[PDB]
Amino acid sequence: MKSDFKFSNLLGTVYRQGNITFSDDGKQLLSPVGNRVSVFDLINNKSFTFEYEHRKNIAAIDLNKQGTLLISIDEDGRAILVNFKARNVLHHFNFKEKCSAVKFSPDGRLFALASGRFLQIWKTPDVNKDRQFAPFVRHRVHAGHFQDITSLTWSQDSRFILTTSKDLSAKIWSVDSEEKNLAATTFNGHRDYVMGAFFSHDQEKIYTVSKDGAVFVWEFTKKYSWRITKKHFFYANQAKVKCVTFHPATRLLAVGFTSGEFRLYDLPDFTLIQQLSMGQNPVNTVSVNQTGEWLAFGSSKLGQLLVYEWQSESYILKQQGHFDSTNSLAYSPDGSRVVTASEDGKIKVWDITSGFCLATFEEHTSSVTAVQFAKRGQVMFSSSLDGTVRAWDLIRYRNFRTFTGTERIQFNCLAVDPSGEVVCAGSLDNFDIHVWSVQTGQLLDALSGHEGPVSCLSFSQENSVLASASWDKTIRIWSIFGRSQQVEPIEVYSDVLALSMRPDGKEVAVSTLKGQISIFNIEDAKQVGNIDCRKDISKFFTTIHYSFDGMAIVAGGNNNSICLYDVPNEVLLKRFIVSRNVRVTSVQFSPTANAFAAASTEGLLIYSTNDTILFDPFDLDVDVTPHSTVEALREKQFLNALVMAFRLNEEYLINKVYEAIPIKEIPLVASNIPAIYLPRILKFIGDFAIESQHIEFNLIWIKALLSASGGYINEHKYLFSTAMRSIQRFIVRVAKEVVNTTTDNKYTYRFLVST
Amino acid sequence: AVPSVQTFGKKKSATAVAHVKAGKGLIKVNGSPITLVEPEILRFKVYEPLLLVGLDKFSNIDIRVRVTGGGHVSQVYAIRQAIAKGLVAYHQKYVDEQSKNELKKAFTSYDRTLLIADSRRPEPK
Amino acid sequence: DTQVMRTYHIQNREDYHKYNRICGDIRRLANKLSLLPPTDPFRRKHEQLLLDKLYAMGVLTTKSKISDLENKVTVSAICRRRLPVIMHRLKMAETIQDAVKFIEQGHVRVGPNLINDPAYLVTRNMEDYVTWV
Amino acid sequence: ELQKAHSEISELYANLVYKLDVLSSV
Amino acid sequence: MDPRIIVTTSRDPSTRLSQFAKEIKLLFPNAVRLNRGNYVMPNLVDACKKSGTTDLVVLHEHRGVPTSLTISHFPHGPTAQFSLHNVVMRHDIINAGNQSEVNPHLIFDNFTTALGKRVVCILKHLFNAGPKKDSERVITFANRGDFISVRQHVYVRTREGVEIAEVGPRFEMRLFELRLGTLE
RNA sequence: CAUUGGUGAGCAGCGAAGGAUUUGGUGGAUUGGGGGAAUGCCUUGUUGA
């Protein structure tokens, strides 16, 4: 593996503060985090743009009128421009001062920034290529006010700017030096502090709201001038109106509270439509869709990290969690679901291929320390600081058992067999290791062998060997299923915390008490010790994992860095997190061989092996044209089209050279493929299958290949392990579709015979 | 001040201390050069740190070691251990890291615990 | 008052107020849980668990009776759970001043983690694992 | 009465366990 | 809960110490026979603390009075040393009758709860090997002041007649050194 | 006897008409618990104008 591994997702949605908005399409959600910007699509949540020039963690964000331009503003007053796929088109330090709000036109000509005591409006650049040192042009600026500008509103004429100010007043701005009605007349009389104003989309009602709950209505009579029309006085509501947004339907109001509840109103009626509670944590900001069908509102960082989507006919579209700093991760045996462990004592399941927050379990009394799956796909065991461990199955959602029984307040490491018979846990403050049969919770023994705190534990796929790393310079090996016990080695060096097993039972990886990470086998032949963990903005060794093909391990400490290594000596690639104020605490490796994970305090995973890179595996260009020679082998010689266009690796060719060959030709092809061109096409089918609707077509392929070379992948293991997992998830996720509905037309014909 | 390190090592009961300073290539045992050890059979065992790394490798080195405790054989397992970690810990500080790994990679392939001391803790199985 | 502020190298003046509020909560818990019929196993069980967790927190290092809960829980007891006082009384440094001088600049280690805070606290069972770097 | 006293004392005990638990691992 | 007992002598046992160690081995599922290749290792504290065991038994021989048994509870550290009556030639028995997992009834005669009570605890804390707690045999601890006697008998009923069965060796010990241990 | 610590005089070598150590300012970029009332207060009822 050599591929360009880079961030194109993140681990759970909103940790931090910011604005929030939709696209004009109604199908794309714009919900930032503090550090980057994560724009989901509403159906099948995915990840589109990933800027990083933000040195400070706050955003202000909006798109113009079709989503071709996105900005994001942090505290300092520099902004960054992207078009559609994070080109990072333009970059622009804009201000030495912070910004409160940013607003486009519905026309894409003008541009709106509120800062300091001024108001900036800019001429918008179109989409082009680059070639501007300074792309933004100043149109006008307006002086002046008395203090800060906190909210901003645009009108439909693109001539008419309604803006509030911090000094309990509002003002009006004609854009094109018109002096619309020859008046920029102030709005006063407000007893309390102003949180927002809105201009209605019929040019006759000018709208203001205050922090107390008061709402003031002015008319377009400019006897002659402004007169009040409807007043209020609220003294018993007794909170503060935190945020406010107005409908493009021009009938409805939305009001957010610090108290933790959600208000809806009507504009000239002042009827109470609905209010909804979600907690006590304050509402930060709220924005409505362009058609009033969907509502979304964001919640503040110290309070809920939760953003709901409620409709006007009252049902919650998207609910979510995404809590704080994370302890542990593990991949499911199907490569789609990822467990997380949080500090507040929950266990949440994340479907991070598709951004759902699926399901939770809450029986913990305090923080969670360890999660890992069993290989059956049935059950998963959680470990806590509760003083006990417990079992879980997936959509039965029911607690099997809660093993404990000696007086204890701290467990720190949890590991189970592949056999599912016995569960072992290592006490951080007892010098002993615990086992339990999963049948009862009987206590078999207490295996007394250490002299320090036992701190990392794992099993083998041979499954007769227990690997037991304690924090006293001593690695130990155990027998559980024989009729005796064993002799346990001594390290040379440097107290260990991180243990990691090869899936063979033949190799053990340890992390020494410095940057040296070291490996040795089960006949203690120490292969490599490897160099430090760099990137200060002391050095550590916290987690380490053996990759599934048996050719790589991944090291993560707590120093803003993560390193790749192979089985020989060499440093492969060092990826790392840039931000500003631990980060990494857990890393494991996917069973799809496409990416892996790194549990960070921000929360960020993916590596994403892609195929945009020109690899030349077996002398690619002696097959001179990728087009015309392949065009010759689409007419003739379908054995040679596979070997020719397979040495080539344009993904824009493999669809056609793979599709075009006929059905009867397929067993003749699979019977005559070379054994060296096998795994990349077995991995190609396992990830091309999940996309298209060619189920019959790919299924006759996998019949031919799996029918062809069964013993060869039986003996030449540990790569077709990964590929075989990738095809098996497609097989089960299509089988449980068509067996269900084919049953649902299998009852029908005999149900006709009934009566 | 001169650049120098100091390591030591021990088999069953004997202990042995080693200085490593920059010099002209001498190896002394309490008063005496290395070619004298007597048991007279096992002298290749203390030659072992020299030829595993190579004959030269000492051209700006001086070595002296000394022996306390132990029986006849167990003195020699000490002094072969002391020169072993002695040589490495010179390369730690003035020669690069990458020489040291090449010592570590070459020694540990042949490892008769040249870098760790054995320690017995008997136990009822 | 400020005798305590000057004895244990407190970096602030706020810390005496904070620990005063926590000890006030412990005393009013003690008084409210005290005024029950003494055969009610609620009172016996909860004062017992309060005793055992105050064993573990190292504040009542002395093995205790019930009436010690009014008596000994002061600010200075929890102030003796601060790190450099554990460091001095474990005979590493020479004065409390020089212990704080070492923790200001990173040479002290509890467990596998670096420490640079003079307000980290130690248990009665974490202080076995204190060394240097 | 007695049940009320068990209510408020179990409340302050539940709060106090939290306040000491903040200092327990920090 | 049930203890883990280790038995150990000097490097030179004869037959008379061998068969004696074979009888003392017969207090299992937790009694294990073991010699040392030194005389007594001073690392037995790391042996028991690392192994997690609770108790230790030492057989040796001195010339202040003749031969000596030694019992110690390991983590706290109380240690009773006792003197024996006869070590000359016992019965060559290593297992006969039942197994030693059978927890017998335990008999103390001549109740002295003044200052021998610490002894009477330890003999309770030693002979609880096994989950049985139901009597098939019986072991007798006879005080005669500072002379105690040890017996092993099996229930032999005959026409509902409570007849004893003498089996195993017959001991008679005296309180030798008992070192004042610690709460540590 | 241990080129063992402190100290001083010379030699081979390295360089040539200057070398070695030490420090100040300046510019660019980065960095509160338990009890209690008179008195006073708070709440509530009342009495006369």
Add this chain to the structure above:
RNA sequence: ACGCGCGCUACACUGACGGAGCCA
């Protein structure tokens, strides 16, 4: 009269005799 068992001492041709080296 005697017996039983443990330790202790010899018979071995890895033999004598003489030195020199040298480790807890």
